[PDB]
């Protein structure tokens, strides 16, 4: 009923930086609370009534606002504090969307290594050819698929990993999914990666008979 | 300790019924939370209850659809859940409220909705491929394919091996099938000593296998 918009919705930060998310109230409201939430764990209690830190947090962290604008802000942004934050309030129980924090650090072009169907996979009939993206830096990668050197829409999945953690990288892996008989058809099949760190485009092939 | 049940898979139309059975401090004294978070969306509030006097506050959105009981003797409260929809998919919390803040939290309960059925997977070698030689380092891994519903676990000779293992979020196919990829990272030269096997357990299949990986 209260609406609470956060920004930024994410943010990457180096640590030593000094961070500062926003988590405005569209009806002035008494107290503001903060919660973090790291992947895989439920929300901890971390700023309430506008600037009490809870019992754990660090003396970095800092609230402040009045109305209709509150802020958390970091003053030395640590490794250990990326997460999502969550600011909320009382009388609507509202949350706002969450502003995601990851850690900066400096680009790093990722290895990138293809694999081709097992055997196993064939005989029952599809196949899928994985490429790998290893340990990179920004998150922006781009895979293009090739097929006897032509591109391929629509038919390949990404999942990446969230940022290592002593290390702050992603992994990002795209699967190509075909039919054994289409499979059959063609020869050359190629992972083209584009990536910040990357002078060119790495191109990773194997060829289906060989 | 608010220690919350297990993963709920559910067909839409059905109701679910999920407990969160608190310890330690007086359970009639406080108000207990439920929240919702879906992936790609924040959290939530659905409702609370008083278990000492069972009056309830209710999100306006799940009033229909959302009941909270509390079996005071017990104490667990419950809630459950109406003609769930594919978007009830979710993890539910509950959580104790201290006064001016959610002091503690269950883990989570995972509800599935789909008309999906259960399909144990298939596990596929990705084996020593690209770098394996002029590299130095080889990637490994094992293709986990066609299962449902999540979760799948992926470990790597039978947990000897932590190093360099990136096991990827879960897609999901077109057909309502999941599938992930577990890869590792090893000195080239290890491929001719080691052996690398990767062991997936699902559960809801009641599904274990165990692949070796060899170049």
């Known amino acids: 009923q209260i609406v609470s918009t956060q920004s930024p919705a994410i943010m990457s930060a180096s640590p030593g930086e000094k961070v500062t998310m926003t988590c405005s109230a569209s009806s002035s409201r008494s107290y503001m609370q903060w919660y973090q939430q790291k992947p895989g764990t439920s929300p901890k209690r971390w700023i309430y009534?506008?600037?009490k830190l809870a019992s754990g947090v660090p003396a970095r962290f800092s609230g402040s606002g009045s109305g209709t604008s509150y802020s958390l802000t970091i003053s030395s942004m640590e490794a250990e504090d990326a997460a999502t934050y969550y600011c909320?309030?009382?009388?609507?129980?509202?949350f706002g969307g969450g502003t995601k924090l990851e850690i900066k650090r400096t680009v790093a072009a990722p290895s990138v290594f293809i694999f081709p169907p097992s055997d196993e996979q064939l005989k029952s009939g599809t196949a899928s050819v994985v490429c790998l993206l290893n340990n990179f830096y920004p998150r922006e990668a781009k895979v293009q698929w090739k097929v006897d050197n032509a591109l391929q829409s629509g038919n390949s999945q990404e999942s990446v990993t969230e940022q290592d953690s002593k290390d702050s990288t992603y992994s990002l892996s795209s699967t190509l999914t075909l039919s054994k008989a289409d499979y059959e058809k063609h020869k050359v099949y190629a992972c083209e990666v584009t990536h910040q760190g990357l002078s060119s485009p790495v191109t990773k092939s194997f060829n289906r008979g060989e | 300790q608010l220690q919350q049940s297990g993963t709920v898979l559910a067909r839409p139309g059905a109701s679910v019924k999920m407990s969160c059975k608190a310890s330690g401090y007086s359970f009639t004294r406080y108000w207990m939370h439920w929240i919702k978070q879906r992936p790609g969306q924040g959290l939530e509030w659905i409702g609370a209850i008083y278990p000492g006097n069972s009056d309830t506050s209710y999100n306006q959105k799940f009033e229909g659809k959302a009941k909270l009981t509390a079996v005071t003797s017990a104490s667990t409260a419950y809630m459950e859940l109406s003609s769930l929809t594919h978007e009830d998919s979710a993890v539910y919390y509950c959580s104790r409220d201290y006064g001016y803040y959610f002091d503690f939290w269950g883990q989570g309960t995972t509800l599935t909705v789909s008309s999906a059925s259960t399909k144990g997977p298939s596990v596929f070698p990705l084996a020593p491929s690209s770098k394996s030689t002029s590299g130095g380092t080889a990637a490994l891994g094992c293709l986990v394919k066609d299962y449902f519903p999540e979760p799948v676990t992926v470990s790597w000779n039978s947990g000897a091996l932590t190093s360099g293992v990136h096991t990827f979020p879960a897609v999901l196919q077109s057909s309502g099938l999941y599938s992930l990829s577990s890869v590792v990272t090893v000195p080239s030269s290890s491929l001719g000593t080691q052996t690398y096997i990767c062991n997936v357990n699902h559960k809801p299949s009641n599904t274990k296998v165990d692949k070796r990986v060899e170049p």
């Open positions: 909320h309030q009382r009388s609507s129980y509202t």
């Open positions: 009534d506008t600037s």
